[PDB]
Design a protein around this ligand. Structure first.
Ligand SMILES: CC(=O)SCCNC(=O)CCNC(=O)[C@H](O)C(C)(C)COP(=O)(O)OP(=O)(O)OC[C@H]1O[C@@H](n2cnc3c(N)ncnc32)[C@H](O)[C@@H]1OP(=O)(O)O
Ligand SMILES: [Zn+2]
Length: 187
């Protein structure tokens, strides 16, 4: 062996990999700490937690909380923020186990892109599509159908009174995990 997987941070490190575990560790535990603000925007309750949503109009403490989770997600993986919404899964331990950021696109044209291993589809844009920019769940909580619950809550609530359909959702170019999570839906 010689390499480790941290039991509270999830990273696998070791040189210079441990001097990078410290910085991500500190960024992690400080990011996932959810105190529990008043009048949170719960979309669904669960035995293993619940799903809140934050909007760009919310208090500063909620927004700054989201940018620090976001900034944590990006380093764990390596645009216009006024139109986003962010969903967070919190554990019963008052910790954030899942994050999903989706942009409301007003000017998106359906296109088909040829890709052997660009055609227009309409003269007008689609009325509303939900672009998923970030989908993240903490490694020691993965494979527990909790991103699936963030999509299910995404689609029930990203636009009040309507239930997003496969046509009405896009996403940014995925990772292997994002791909492995997507073929869930394709079919
Ligand atoms: C930003 C972009 O748009 S791409 C960014 C993608 N995010 C990441 O890569 C971060 C690291 N990965 C993760 O956080 C998670 O693996 C996510 C976000 C991809 C999905 O979270 P998960 O909780 O694991 O997904 P969830 O449990 O809800 O459903 C996963 C399903 O995907 C399918 N799947 C198959 N293989 C895998 C795999 N290796 N990993 C994940 N899902 C898989 C399964 O059908 C699985 O359902 P099942 O467990 O009942 O068999
Ligand atoms: Zn650690």
């Amino acid at each position: 062996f010689g390499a480790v997987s941290c039991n509270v941070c999830g990273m696998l490190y070791t040189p210079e990999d441990e001097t990078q575990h410290l910085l991500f560790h500190n960024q992690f535990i400080s990011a996932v700490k959810y105190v529990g603000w008043k009048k949170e925007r719960i979309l669904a309750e669960y035995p293993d937690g619940r799903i809140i949503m934050v909007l760009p109009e919310d208090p500063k403490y909620a927004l700054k909380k989201v940018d620090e989770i976001r900034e944590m997600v990006d380093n764990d993986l390596g645009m216009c923020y006024s139109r986003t919404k962010t969903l967070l899964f919190i554990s019963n331990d008052k910790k954030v186990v899942g994050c999903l950021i989706a942009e409301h696109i007003q000017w998106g044209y359906r296109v088909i892109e040829e890709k052997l291993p660009a055609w227009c589809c309409s003269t007008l844009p689609e009325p509303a599509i939900c672009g998923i920019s970030r989908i993240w769940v903490f490694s020691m909580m993965r494979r527990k159908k909790i991103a699936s619950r963030m999509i299910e809550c995404l689609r029930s609530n990203f636009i009040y009174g309507s239930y997003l359909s496969k046509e009405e959702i896009a996403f940014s170019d995925p990772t292997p995990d994002g791909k492995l999570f997507a073929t869930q839906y394709c079919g």
